[PDB]
Amino acid sequence: SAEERAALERSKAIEKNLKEDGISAAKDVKLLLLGADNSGKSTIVKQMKITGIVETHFTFKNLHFRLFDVGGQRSERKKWIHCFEDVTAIIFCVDLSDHESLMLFDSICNNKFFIDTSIILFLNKKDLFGEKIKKSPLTICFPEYTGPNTYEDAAAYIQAQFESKNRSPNKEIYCHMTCATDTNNAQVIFDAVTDIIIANNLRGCGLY
């Protein structure tokens, strides 16, 4: 222990830094973006301002959000999706202008690592879908469905179709409708994140 005492001193001095950095980084709420190509995730992440992972972070009402857009990873998601196992909530987007994203939603909500995460669903491109329905019946994209042909019911039907893919009671799909022209996304995200934080904290203590 001639100078190894100084080695132990340095080891402790940087272990303290590791602990402090981890505690400081634990204050952030990790979020994960998902969706099809040109499904409106870009505009909703740009509304808050600020080819691998494109991280976008913003502070809203004393909460620090971290958004991970993984659209650049044009590879097999099976080998890297588990890196996001600790994400607080999954933000999933579907464009209503186009059924193509149903398989993706089923894969995400039935995935082993995401059995306890809350998928905050967004229905963007509201006005485009409304004008498409007003021009042509909504049954074009859903040949099976033959119910009333109106926007106010077609939107509810598509929301029910997307929500039917859930198979667990521990997760709640906080659906919402967006027109890519309103700043209401932040409030919906904030409310959903508060609810998920409450649920996770209660589950940790055994009260839930």
Partner 1 sequence: DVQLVESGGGLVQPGGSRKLSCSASGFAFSSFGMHWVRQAPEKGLEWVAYISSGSGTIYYADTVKGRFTISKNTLFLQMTSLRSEDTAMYYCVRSIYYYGSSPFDFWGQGTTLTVSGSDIVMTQATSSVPVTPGESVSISCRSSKSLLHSNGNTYLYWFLQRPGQSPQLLIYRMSNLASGVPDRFSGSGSGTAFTLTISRLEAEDVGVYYCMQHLEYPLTFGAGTKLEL
Partner 2 sequence: LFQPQDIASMVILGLTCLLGLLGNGLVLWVAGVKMKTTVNTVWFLHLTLADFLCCLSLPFSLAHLILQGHWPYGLFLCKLIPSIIILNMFASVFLLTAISLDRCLIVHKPIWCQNHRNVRTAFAICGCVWVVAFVMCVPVFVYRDLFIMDNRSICRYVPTPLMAITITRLVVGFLVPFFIMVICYSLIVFRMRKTNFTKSRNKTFRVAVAVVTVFFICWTPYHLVGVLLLITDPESSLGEAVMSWDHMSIALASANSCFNPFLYALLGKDFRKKARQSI
Partner 3 sequence: ELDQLRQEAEQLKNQIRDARKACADATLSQITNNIDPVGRIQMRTRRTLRGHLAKIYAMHWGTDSRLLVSASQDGKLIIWDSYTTNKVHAIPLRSSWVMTCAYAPSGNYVACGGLDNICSIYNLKTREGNVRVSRELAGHTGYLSCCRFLDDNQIVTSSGDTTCALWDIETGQQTTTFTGHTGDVMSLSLAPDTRLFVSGACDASAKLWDVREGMCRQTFTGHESDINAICFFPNGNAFATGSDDATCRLFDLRADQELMTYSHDNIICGITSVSFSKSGRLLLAGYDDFNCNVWDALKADRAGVLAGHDNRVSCLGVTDDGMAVATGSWDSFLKIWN
Query: Which parts of this chain interact with partner 2 (CB under 8 A)?
Result: 23, 26-27, 29, 61-63, 169, 194-195, 197-198, 201-202, 204-208
Amino acid identity, position 183: T
Separation of alpha carbons 193 and 170, rounded Å: 15
Q: Answer with the entry of partner 3, partner 2, partner 1, none that 144 interacts with (C-beta below 5 to 8 A by kind).
A: none
Residue closest to 178 by CA, chosen among 47, 29, 32: 47
Residue closest to 31 by CA, chosen among 58, 9, 1: 58
* Cβ 10 to partner 3 shortest distance, Å: 8
Q: Answer with the entry of partner 2, partner 3, partner 1, none that 2 interacts with (C-beta below 5 to 8 A by kind).
A: partner 1
Residues 54 and 83: beta-carbon distance below 8 Å: no
* Cβ 27 to partner 2 shortest distance, Å: 5
Q: Answer with the entry of partner 1, partner 3, partner 2, none that 127 interacts with (C-beta below 5 to 8 A by kind).
A: none
Radius of gyration in angstroms for the set of CA atoms belonging to the chain, rounded to a whole number: 21
Residue closest to 91 by CA, chosen among 120, 68, 50, 56: 120
Q: How many residues bind partner 3 (CB under 8 A)?
A: 25
Task: Pick the closer one to partner 3 by CB: 17 or 168.
Answer: 17
50 binds partner 3 (CB under 8 A): no
135 binds partner 3 (CB under 8 A): no
Among 53, 115, 160, 198, binds partner 3 (CB under 8 A): 53
Which residues, 2 to 21, sit near partner 1 by CB under 8 A? Answer: 2-7, 9-10, 13
Enumerate the β-bridge partners of residue 119.
Answer: 90
Which residues, 10 to 69, sit near partner 1 by CB under 8 A? Answer: 10, 13
Whole-angstrom CA distances from 23 to 10, 19, 56 are 20, 6, 21
Angle at 86 between CA 50 and CA 194, to 5 degrees: 65
Residues that bind partner 1 (CB under 8 A): 2-7, 9-10, 13
